[PDB]
Design an enzyme around this catalytic site. Sequence first.
Site, mmCIF file in Angstrom:
data_model
loop_
_atom_site.group_PDB
_atom_site.id
_atom_site.type_symbol
_atom_site.label_atom_id
_atom_site.label_comp_id
_atom_site.label_asym_id
_atom_site.label_seq_id
_atom_site.Cartn_x
_atom_site.Cartn_y
_atom_site.Cartn_z
ATOM 1 N N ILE A 105 0.842 -1.189 0.000
ATOM 2 C CA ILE A 105 0.000 0.000 0.000
ATOM 3 C C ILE A 105 0.880 1.242 0.000
ATOM 4 O O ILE A 105 1.791 1.378 0.826
ATOM 5 C CB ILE A 105 -0.945 -0.007 1.210
ATOM 6 C CG1 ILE A 105 -1.798 -1.274 1.217
ATOM 7 C CG2 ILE A 105 -1.831 1.227 1.200
ATOM 8 C CD1 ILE A 105 -2.504 -1.515 2.531
ATOM 9 N N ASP A 106 0.611 2.155 -0.929
ATOM 10 C CA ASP A 106 1.323 3.423 -1.010
ATOM 11 C C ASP A 106 0.430 4.526 -0.454
ATOM 12 O O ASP A 106 -0.667 4.763 -0.970
ATOM 13 C CB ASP A 106 1.738 3.733 -2.448
ATOM 14 C CG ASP A 106 0.602 3.557 -3.435
ATOM 15 O OD1 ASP A 106 -0.416 2.936 -3.066
ATOM 16 O OD2 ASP A 106 0.726 4.042 -4.578
ATOM 17 N N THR A 107 0.899 5.191 0.595
ATOM 18 C CA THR A 107 0.139 6.245 1.250
ATOM 19 C C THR A 107 0.391 7.620 0.648
ATOM 20 O O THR A 107 -0.216 8.598 1.098
ATOM 21 C CB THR A 107 0.461 6.275 2.746
ATOM 22 O OG1 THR A 107 1.851 6.565 2.930
ATOM 23 C CG2 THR A 107 0.142 4.934 3.383
#
Lengths: 72, 214, 261, 71
Positions: B168-170
């Site tokens: 997951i890329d925030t």
Amino acid sequence: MDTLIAMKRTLLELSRSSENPLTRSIDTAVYRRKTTLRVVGTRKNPNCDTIHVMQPPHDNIEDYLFTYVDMN
Amino acid sequence: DAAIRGNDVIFVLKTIGVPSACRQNEDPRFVEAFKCDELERYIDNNPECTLFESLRDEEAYSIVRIFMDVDLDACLDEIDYLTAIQDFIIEVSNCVARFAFTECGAIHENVIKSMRSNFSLTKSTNRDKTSFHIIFLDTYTTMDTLIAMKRTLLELSRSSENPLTRSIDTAVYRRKTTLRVVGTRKNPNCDTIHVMQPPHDNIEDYLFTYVDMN
Amino acid sequence: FISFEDAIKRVSKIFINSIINFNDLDENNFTTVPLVIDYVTPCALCKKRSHKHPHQLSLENGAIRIYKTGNPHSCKVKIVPLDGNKLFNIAQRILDTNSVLLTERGDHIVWINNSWKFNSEEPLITKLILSIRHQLPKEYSSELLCPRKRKTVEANIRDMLVDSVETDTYPDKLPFKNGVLDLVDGMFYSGDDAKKYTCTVSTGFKFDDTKFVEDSPEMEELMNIINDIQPLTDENKKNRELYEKTLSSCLCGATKGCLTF
Amino acid sequence: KRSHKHPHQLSLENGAIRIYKTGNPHSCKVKIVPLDGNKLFNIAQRILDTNSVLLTERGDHIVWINNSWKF
Ligand SMILES: Nc1ncnc2c1ncn2[C@@H]1O[C@H](COP(=O)(O)OP(=O)(O)OP(=O)(O)O)[C@@H](O)[C@H]1O
Ligand SMILES: [Zn+2]
């Protein structure tokens, strides 16, 4: 020798099963080809100041060498 | 609150790195405002066009669906993919519901039910990569809520062990966010696009600004 | 992160076999040199036998991913973290499930068996930890079978709870041991639907719609008793009008401002 | 679903039994069962299955020994 390379799975599974305090801190990959073990009183590097402390009642060198075999 | 106010116009860009002033100037060569059917026609007649979806003015209307992006540089079989996606859904739902209950003062069970009821997934044409955008249809919140929840999402990504969760890329949750339109060319010299999902055969299920409170 | 030697340690525990190039890994080239292991036991990732290509390690998101060059489906992908404790992560997940809460009275309420329970002298937290292990991934369920780890997780959870919450705020809901019924509609919510209303008390008898039938022989004979006690006569109608007011007043959980004789 | 026309199938991996539907796996759900655990936990589970120890409503435990219930 070849016994030592075959119980590695056994001791790793015993350590995973047994919940005794220090049993969780054993090493398995030590058993290998051309295994090297540090001699007592010899530092890993001159920078490192950590040495092995001698423990009675054994004081002789042969008491801490697994490459020595004697029949009594 | 909004009640009658429900977004139906779709704001779309045409190229990354849009010049600043021309956005307020609203030049037709980079900024468009369409509906579902004519946007579908515009992406159908032109197969080589590049489209990017974003909001226009969050100072008056800044309510959007929940969206997340995942990208991993490895290939997985179908069964492992299903197990990973199930665990990922469960963990993300729990984390988001906990954050909403703790800070936003919402209800845990309603959030969980809404986010686990309907969600839309995509796939990437690349064989050696596993990437997708996930959209939660029945959950709506403000952009500042996503900004605040970014830290918790990053913590969950670091703590977890599922390969999908670690990817997951925030960074997508920031000012003036943009997203790739599904089934649209990314680069003029790149053939990698996103495809549909058999559960959802409609375009309006893959946009995170199209809001309709049922 | 952590010490590099510990990273090599964990990687070498992951690979049940030994590697030949152990001396060739350094702090600046461990992501480039291919990894070849000794071939005496099948690799832990996939059973197979005698993988024909070397493996490789990549560093992303504070973790090490192991992938085998060549066929992607030949060997399974493995991710090794290097950051935190497993017990802390388990406690975080359990808190995220929102099953244990702290009340203003200083006691902890726990959602077990479709009900809210609290005990002032028993650690229900450990029972909740044991019971909730079915909703966790495979790697977390095995750790909850040891009592000491359960106590550690309980300590972490107790440390994590700072704020309090209110309970029993809806006076129009009648709770049971299997659910809660709404007094304004008569619909009975069971399971997770009843979790919304934090009710810490129950009638003690489970709800059952089979006996909740108007057209039943048991219902018919009750009008005889109610007429014997309260005749349906006009001069007593006011009394009758009063009689049902107190009788129906027992259902709600709000303060009453009158005394009845 | 209805009757699950495609037969199910079993697999074993990293000490876990996986159940999945053949044909189109997306039409069903994959289930996981861990066939592993501690020896002491297994012993406790067997003892509980014997149904010799019970909990009372007053917080006391009753055991069954010497053909008698004692607390
Ligand atoms: N080729 C190798 N295969 C497996 N493990 C290795 C190899 N080379 C080094 N190690 C490991 O690297 C570590 C280096 O030794 P360290 O000083 O950390 O502890 P140790 O093994 O207790 O020390 P000592 O050398 O005094 O026995 C050990 O854990 C050792 O097992
Ligand atoms: Zn393998």
